[PDB]
């Protein structure tokens, strides 16, 4: 197809594989859980306003 | 006095209309909070599906 | 008077009053959400 599209696909496919090597399961699992809980906290407040 | 009577009727109708408008604005002010509740429901459900 | 907004001072006063009442209501709802016959 295009050419610029192809170049940027190559650059992206390189950066992504660079990042995916840094991810470590034992830590990213905990980070995901932490953000999960943060979002739940921020939803509680909406429910509270509904009740009020 | 003939005209004073009609003037009185007009003032009564105007007072009634003003009260009605106040009531409707209050209703809208409640609907606003109900809509915020709906926004929160939408975001909570979207959170659940992402799981 | 409570229900009319001819004066800016009252406008601001009532606005803050409602804001604070809403804050207290939020606290009470959060209390409920997460959770006298005997002494008579």
């Amino acid at each position: 197809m295009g050419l610029f599209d192809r170049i940027k696909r190559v650059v992206s496919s390189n950066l992504n594989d660079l990042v995916n090597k840094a991810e470590d399961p034992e830590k990213m699992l905990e980070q995901a859980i932490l953000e999960m809980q943060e979002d739940l906290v921020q939803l509680r407040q909406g429910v509270a306003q509904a009740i009020a | 006095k003939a005209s004073l009577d009609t003037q009185s009727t007009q003032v009564e109708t105007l007072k009634r209309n003003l009260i009605q408008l106040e009531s409707k604005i209050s209703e809208a002010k409640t609907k606003k909070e109900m809509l915020k509740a709906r926004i929160t429901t939408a975001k909570a459900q979207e959170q659940l599906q992402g799981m | 008077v409570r229900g009319m907004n001819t004066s800016s001072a009252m406008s601001a006063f009532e606005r803050m009053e409602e804001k604070v009442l809403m804050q207290e209501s939020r606290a009470q709802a959060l209390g409920e959400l997460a959770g006298g016959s005997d002494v008579d």
Side-chain angles (χ1 to χ4, degrees), chain A residues 8-23:
Chain A
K8 98 184 187 184
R9 163 164 298 113
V10 157
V11 159
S12 179
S13 172
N14 228 316
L15 286 184
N16 274 14
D17 172 280
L18 179 57
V19 164
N20 282 12
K21 262 188 188 171
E23 290 192 346

Side-chain angles (χ1 to χ4, degrees), chain C residues 23-35:
Chain C
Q23 184 168 358
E24 166 173 29
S25 304
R26 176 195 331 301
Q28 186 173 355
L30 214 68
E32 176 189 347
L33 181 78

